[PDB]
Amino acid sequence: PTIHFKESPFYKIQRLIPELVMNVEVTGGRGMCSAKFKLSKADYNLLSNPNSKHRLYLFSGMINPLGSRGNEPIQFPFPNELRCNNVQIKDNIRGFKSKPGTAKPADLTPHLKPYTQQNNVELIYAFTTKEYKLFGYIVEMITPEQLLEKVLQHPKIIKQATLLYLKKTLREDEEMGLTTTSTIMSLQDPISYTRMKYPSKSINCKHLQCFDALWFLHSQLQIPTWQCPVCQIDIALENLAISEFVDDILQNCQKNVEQVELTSDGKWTAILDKLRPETHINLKVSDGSSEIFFKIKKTTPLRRLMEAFAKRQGKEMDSLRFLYDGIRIQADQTPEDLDMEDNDIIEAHRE
Amino acid sequence: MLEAKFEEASLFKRIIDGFKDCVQLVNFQCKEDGIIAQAVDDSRVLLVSLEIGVEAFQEYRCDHPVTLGMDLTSLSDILREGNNTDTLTLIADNTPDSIILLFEDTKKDDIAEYSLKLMDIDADFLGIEELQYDSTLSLPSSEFSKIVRDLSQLSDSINIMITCETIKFVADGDIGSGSVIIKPFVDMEHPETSIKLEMDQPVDLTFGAKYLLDIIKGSSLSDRVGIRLSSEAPALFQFDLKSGFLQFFLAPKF
Amino acid sequence: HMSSLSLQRLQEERKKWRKDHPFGFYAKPVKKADGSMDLQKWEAGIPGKEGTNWAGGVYPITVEYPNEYPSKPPKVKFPAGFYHPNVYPSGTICLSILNEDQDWRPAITLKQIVLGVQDLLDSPNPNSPKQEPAWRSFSRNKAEYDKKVLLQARQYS
Amino acid sequence: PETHINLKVSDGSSEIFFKIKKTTPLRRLMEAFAKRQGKEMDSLRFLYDGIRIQADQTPEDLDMEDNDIIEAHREQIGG
Ligand SMILES: [Zn+2]
């Protein structure tokens, strides 16, 4: 009675540990099953040698009386306490409840005894409605950077496709009485909020926004949802493609440019006094309505900053309190005391 | 020939108490695999289904499939004379016209024997257990009974609304309205007192209070009760026995 | 022991909040025992909207970022005993945008989160209350409910 | 225009500039912004001057001037 789990691009199953198999029975009360296994010197060194690309993952599958149809998700009984040689395993074997297949295997590698000694994995559970089957496989790790190399070899979303999408979505607005004059697109990755290096999306994505393929593979290693971070459609690794249109913008833009404004034809322009000495700091004071941009020395106290702001508002300084990071700031304190940086915000409130 | 021996006489007493105040005529079908009993009230909306396995009896024997149509209000009177420390035993012929209830005390070494005349009850109602349900919750039967009791004195209709991992019982009446909210939890140190919830889809149903007041009477059987709710299907309230169960099929209001 | 994406995203989230956050709000990572910042646990403050009973008060919360962030949503928690129908007695809340099984997206910023917690204060959901003291008053005595909110606003001010 | 007006719909990252007549309902305006972002129109809160906008309203019903900004927020529910 073996169970075939849905494969993952981050790890490929190699060999099974026959002794590391246990069953979870249906019970309304407490339950616990253990499994003792021993590893050879070859397998122990395979898993313990430094920079080893192999691990010992603990899989779990929910038994179906109708028979396994293949590509089963990973499902552990909850609540539970997983233990490997009396070490409570705090891995994330739960994933998302509403999305089966988001649970990752448990990593037994850091808790293995030397090959001369006998290991022991214990699973405590309570109030189970289904039967679960546990397996212990040796896997080979695949890094997100290795998967990115295959994405760059895949065919790209060419500029012709994006121009057709822009022309299609424009005429659909004309039929709806709308006129799209221009669109401002962000060059930042919605996953990491860094400047995109590999702007990508699924070939089935019906939107213009892109995300970084490398950071997207990092997020799938966190939780394997395999959905677009923008439109939430299901995404296969082979259907992830680099956007030729968005990549060309990044190659012809300055690294400080976070946004670009483009028209329906494909043309785009980059969206763009702050120069100071290395002893001053750029601050931004606000009262909820107006905001003044200051530039004072990091050593000078904020007392004269509070005076210059209260004076421009025609109000006495005794009636205004100034907050930074929620905490009220004293007059004798300098931006160096409060660990301020450029473009920080100081809020002003009345009494 | 039938010979089912309940290890504890109060067990079969609690079973009959679970659906004697809503159904008057029940057709008990006995086989070698156990005892099956299903009935339905005059409203034709509440279906009582009973199953008892051979693992629940101290001893059991049923050479031929025997059907025992009984009157509950008369059978409950016989069981009323029995003691909660006795050993009930049911005996019937191969072609029986009556049943014999044998009460055997285990301590005082006493024997009391009663007899009931069988009735011929036609018709049937197969227990249509649905394939799946939107939500499935189970909680202590004593707590679910107090919820129904506290809300029945507020309206003749109780609404079960499950959303955002939260179970809210609503009762909207003429004089006033009330509500009871319970939160799911499964404590490993005491799993028998948990409120488990397996919500595949948020449900929102409504049931008659007088019907739920009859369902909670099965609390004497199991410490817990399972409630399986579906949108396009009647609800399923079940009380687990040692080898069987007593379940109710109530259709929600629309 | 922190992943590359969690650290990078948390560093960008603090960079964005430092220079552009809504007025009256504050949010900063808490300090460890050695004084260094814990980017996975923040202290924040939600000011009540003007005109509503919650006005004048700044209510503190805790934002705990899990290891799987931003694939998993962070957890927000008021002080235990906070008076609101949809707030647990322990202080936990449950917004649809902070629910991994619902409307949580990795592109949700801290600015959108603190604005979502603010909109819940003066707009409870009767379909799923999380406590009893605030649910009773909200469901059978609006006059006393506003009395506590006007008192709790003066409490956190 | 004096017959048409320009409006800006933003979510803090991406924004689109439109142009319609003051009598045109904003329902078409909202469905376009959400469809171009890969979202459903019933999952966003469009606000003007900090007030929610119905699908039946028009720019003249709320007295929208030129280059006014419409903020799009994520729809949420507590519990
Ligand atoms: Zn997409």
Side-chain angles (χ1 to χ4, degrees), chain A residues 1-272 276-351, chain B residues 1-121 123-124 127 129-252 254, chain C residues 2-157, chain D:
Chain A
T2 179
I3 295 183
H4 174 260
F5 300 90
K6 182 182 180 183
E7 297 184 4
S8 172
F10 297 101
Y11 59 88
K12 43 185 174 180
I13 296 181
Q14 298 286 82
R15 183 171 58 259
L16 172 62
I17 304 300
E19 310 86 343
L20 187 51
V21 170
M22 46 194 179
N23 300 259
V24 181
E25 55 188 6
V26 179
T27 174
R30 297 176 54 90
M32 174 263 299
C33 60
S34 62
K36 298 173 180 55
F37 69 101
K38 195 174 185 178
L39 292 177
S40 63
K41 179 190 293 184
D43 284 344
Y44 177 81
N45 287 323
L46 178 70
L47 302 174
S48 296
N49 286 340
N51 268 322
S52 176
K53 307 310 171 185
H54 290 71
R55 259 80 162 184
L56 176 58
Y57 281 175
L58 182 69
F59 290 80
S60 178
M62 184 179 63
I63 299 180
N64 181 24
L66 286 76
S68 178
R69 298 195 300 102
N71 285 267
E72 297 276 11
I74 295 172
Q75 287 177 326
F76 288 81
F78 291 88
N80 71 83
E81 176 184 2
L82 179 56
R83 294 166 62 90
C84 182
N85 294 321
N86 287 330
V87 182
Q88 183 178 81
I89 293 182
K90 303 178 179 179
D91 291 35
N92 183 24
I93 59 179
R94 178 57 165 175
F96 296 169
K97 307 95 178 182
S98 63
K99 293 182 179 179
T102 54
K104 302 194 299 295
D107 199 346
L108 306 167
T109 311
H111 319 291
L112 292 178
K113 292 181 179 178
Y115 73 100
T116 60
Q117 305 187 23
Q118 184 177 184
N119 295 277
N120 182 24
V121 178
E122 180 181 8
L123 173 62
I124 315 172
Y125 53 92
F127 205 166
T128 53
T129 61
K130 316 295 182 179
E131 288 194 352
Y132 297 89
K133 190 68 174 301
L134 276 288
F135 293 102
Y137 289 101
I138 294 180
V139 302
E140 180 171 342
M141 303 301 301
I142 289 91
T143 54
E145 190 172 5
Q146 287 168 325
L147 295 178
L148 176 69
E149 185 178 354
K150 295 298 179 298
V151 180
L152 303 177
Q153 299 174 354
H154 289 356
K156 306 177 182 180
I157 299 178
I158 56 182
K159 182 182 177 61
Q160 178 188 11
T162 63
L163 293 175
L164 284 169
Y165 167 79
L166 290 176
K167 182 180 180 180
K168 171 181 173 59
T169 189
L170 179 67
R171 312 307 170 184
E172 293 178 356
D173 296 340
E174 307 291 340
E175 301 168 347
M176 300 273 279
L178 298 147
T179 300
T180 300
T181 77
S182 63
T183 303
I184 292 182
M185 186 207 300
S186 176
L187 303 181
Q188 306 298 138
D189 178 37
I191 294 180
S192 62
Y193 281 81
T194 65
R195 179 180 178 88
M196 285 187 296
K197 302 182 181 181
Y198 313 90
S200 69
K201 56 191 174 189
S202 177
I203 57 181
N204 303 323
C205 286
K206 293 296 179 298
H207 56 78
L208 182 58
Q209 191 171 352
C210 290
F211 54 88
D212 188 88
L214 183 55
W215 286 120
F216 173 76
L217 293 167
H218 274 72
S219 59
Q220 296 309 308
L221 191 57
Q222 294 179 326
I223 306 293
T225 67
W226 294 105
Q227 297 178 351
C228 173
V230 183
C231 60
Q232 297 303 116
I233 69 178
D234 286 343
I235 286 190
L237 179 57
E238 60 273 10
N239 293 332
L240 194 61
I242 300 296
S243 174
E244 177 183 354
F245 173 78
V246 185
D247 178 86
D248 182 83
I249 296 180
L250 300 166
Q251 300 298 326
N252 299 266
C253 235
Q254 196 176 359
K255 264 53 188 175
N256 54 20
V257 177
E258 300 183 14
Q259 290 179 321
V260 289
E261 182 180 16
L262 50 86
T263 57
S264 56
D265 53 15
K267 301 181 179 181
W268 62 270
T269 58
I271 295 181
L272 304 182
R276 71 175 211 281
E278 299 172 357
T279 57
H280 284 52
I281 179 180
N282 285 323
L283 296 181
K284 170 185 174 181
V285 188
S286 175
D287 56 15
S289 304
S290 58
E291 53 190 38
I292 301 180
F293 298 87
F294 276 79
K295 183 188 300 182
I296 64 175
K297 184 183 181 183
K298 304 175 182 178
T299 317
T300 305
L302 292 166
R303 180 169 58 258
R304 288 203 48 84
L305 179 144
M306 302 153 71
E307 295 178 0
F309 184 83
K311 186 177 183 179
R312 280 208 177 186
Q313 304 298 334
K315 197 59 180 181
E316 302 290 344
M317 180 179 169
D318 299 90
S319 60
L320 287 179
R321 69 178 197 273
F322 294 82
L323 309 177
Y324 174 67
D325 275 20
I327 307 177
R328 185 171 182 174
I329 61 184
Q330 293 182 346
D332 57 274
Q333 299 176 352
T334 187
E336 186 181 13
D337 302 335
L338 307 166
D339 295 312
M340 293 182 174
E341 302 188 29
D342 280 35
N343 310 129
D344 268 18
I345 296 182
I346 301 179
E347 292 191 354
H349 306 80
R350 303 180 306 271
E351 297 287 352
Chain B
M1 181 164 296
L2 173 66
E3 189 174 356
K5 184 182 185 63
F6 288 87
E7 179 181 344
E8 190 173 359
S10 67
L11 212 171
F12 186 74
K13 176 60 179 179
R14 295 171 181 178
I15 295 179
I16 302 303
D17 295 335
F19 58 100
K20 64 174 183 59
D21 292 11
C22 60
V23 185
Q24 307 300 329
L25 304 179
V26 178
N27 214 28
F28 291 80
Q29 302 181 8
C30 306
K31 288 187 176 183
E32 58 182 357
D33 195 31
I35 299 181
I36 308 300
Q38 295 178 354
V40 57
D41 63 331
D42 298 273
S43 302
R44 299 181 181 179
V45 62
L46 172 61
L47 198 159
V48 180
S49 182
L50 173 65
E51 172 174 338
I52 306 179
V54 301
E55 305 281 5
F57 305 95
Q58 180 178 354
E59 69 178 6
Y60 188 87
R61 188 175 68 93
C62 195
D63 307 331
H64 320 279
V66 181
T67 300
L68 302 178
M70 313 178 192
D71 177 27
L72 291 193
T73 183
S74 302
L75 182 63
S76 61
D77 300 338
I78 292 180
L79 302 172
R80 194 168 307 170
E81 295 291 333
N83 181 204
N84 299 270
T85 63
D86 294 11
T87 301
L88 179 63
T89 310
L90 306 185
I91 301 179
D93 305 329
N94 47 19
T95 311
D97 57 324
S98 301
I99 56 169
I100 300 173
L101 287 80
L102 187 61
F103 293 88
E104 287 183 326
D105 197 337
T106 58
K107 309 302 179 180
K108 290 186 176 181
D109 204 333
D110 292 16
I111 295 181
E113 174 168 303
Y114 298 85
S115 58
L116 183 61
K117 186 67 177 182
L118 289 171
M119 299 183 181
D120 203 323
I121 308 173
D124 200 271
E129 193 182 49
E130 310 296 336
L131 277 59
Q132 293 297 281
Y133 295 87
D134 299 345
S135 301
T136 295
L137 64 148
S138 55
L139 67 156
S141 59
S142 59
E143 182 178 357
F144 170 67
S145 298
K146 180 175 174 55
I147 293 179
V148 178
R149 281 151 41 199
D150 294 342
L151 294 180
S152 296
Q153 58 177 356
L154 254 174
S155 174
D156 58 329
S157 301
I158 301 182
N159 170 263
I160 303 180
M161 182 167 56
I162 302 177
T163 173
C164 298
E165 207 75 9
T166 293
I167 310 170
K168 178 182 178 183
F169 300 99
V170 189
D172 193 335
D174 295 324
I175 302 300
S177 62
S179 183
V180 170
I181 292 89
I182 57 178
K183 306 162 188 174
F185 70 99
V186 184
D187 173 82
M188 288 197 301
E189 305 297 334
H190 305 279
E192 293 77 11
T193 71
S194 300
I195 302 182
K196 188 174 182 60
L197 176 57
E198 291 171 319
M199 168 182 160
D200 289 18
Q201 184 75 3
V203 83
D204 183 21
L205 305 178
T206 300
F207 308 94
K210 290 183 62 63
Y211 296 93
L212 292 173
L213 286 170
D214 293 330
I215 296 179
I216 65 174
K217 301 180 180 181
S219 307
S220 56
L221 298 178
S222 178
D223 304 279
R224 302 180 55 84
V225 53
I227 306 178
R228 289 187 272 186
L229 302 169
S230 177
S231 60
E232 305 168 353
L236 189 271
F237 303 81
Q238 183 171 330
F239 299 82
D240 294 331
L241 300 178
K242 181 182 180 62
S243 185
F245 50 86
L246 174 65
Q247 56 187 10
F248 304 88
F249 293 86
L250 175 58
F254 294 95
Chain C
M2 190 182 305
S3 60
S4 185
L5 173 56
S6 299
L7 177 64
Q8 185 61 54
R9 171 60 182 270
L10 287 174
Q11 285 173 345
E12 296 295 334
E13 283 289 332
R14 188 171 185 264
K15 179 183 177 182
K16 297 180 84 288
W17 180 273
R18 261 185 173 269
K19 57 184 299 180
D20 181 31
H21 65 82
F23 188 82
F25 290 74
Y26 76 89
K28 54 179 180 298
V30 309
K31 302 302 185 300
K32 301 179 181 179
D34 62 339
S36 56
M37 296 189 307
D38 178 19
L39 270 64
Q40 295 185 331
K41 186 173 184 177
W42 293 37
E43 175 192 3
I46 308 302
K49 291 182 177 179
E50 295 288 347
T52 64
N53 291 324
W54 303 82
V58 183
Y59 314 98
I61 59 174
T62 300
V63 186
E64 301 175 358
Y65 294 94
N67 299 321
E68 294 76 25
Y69 183 81
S71 295
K72 281 178 63 69
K75 302 175 182 59
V76 181
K77 178 176 58 181
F78 283 91
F82 193 80
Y83 196 76
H84 189 279
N86 308 97
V87 171
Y88 283 85
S90 58
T92 311
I93 68 174
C94 197
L95 289 175
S96 66
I97 61 173
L98 304 176
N99 192 309
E100 61 193 25
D101 304 276
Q102 298 190 21
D103 302 328
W104 162 252
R105 307 296 176 250
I108 294 181
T109 55
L110 179 60
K111 182 192 187 70
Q112 305 175 13
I113 294 178
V114 298
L115 289 181
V117 181
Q118 182 188 53
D119 193 80
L120 184 60
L121 302 179
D122 200 74
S123 301
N125 176 35
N127 283 318
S128 184
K130 298 309 191 302
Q131 67 177 266
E132 180 74 6
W135 169 239
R136 278 192 55 170
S137 193
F138 195 77
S139 63
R140 73 189 60 172
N141 197 328
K142 288 301 196 306
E144 277 288 347
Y145 179 91
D146 298 28
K147 237 66 176 183
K148 297 295 182 179
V149 180
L150 288 173
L151 177 64
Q152 195 177 215
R154 292 189 294 265
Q155 176 189 9
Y156 292 103
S157 183
Chain D
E2 295 292 338
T3 171
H4 293 358
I5 207 67
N6 295 335
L7 294 179
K8 172 184 175 180
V9 192
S10 176
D11 55 19
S13 303
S14 63
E15 47 206 21
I16 310 174
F17 295 95
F18 291 91
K19 177 176 64 178
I20 53 176
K21 185 157 58 175
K22 296 179 176 58
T23 189
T24 306
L26 299 179
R27 185 195 314 269
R28 323 280 78 178
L29 187 274
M30 301 167 182
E31 296 180 0
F33 178 83
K35 193 260 295 297
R36 299 166 73 100
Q37 302 296 337
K39 306 175 184 177
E40 297 292 341
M41 195 267 294
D42 286 29
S43 62
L44 293 177
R45 291 181 178 179
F46 297 90
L47 311 184
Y48 177 75
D49 291 336
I51 305 180
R52 207 176 196 270
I53 316 171
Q54 301 177 2
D56 315 332
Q57 302 174 358
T58 66
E60 70 175 11
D61 297 345
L62 298 86
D63 189 77
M64 291 182 178
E65 297 186 5
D66 197 36
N67 303 337
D68 284 28
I69 301 179
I70 301 178
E71 301 175 359
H73 301 243
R74 295 182 180 269
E75 175 71 293
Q76 70 178 32
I77 181 64

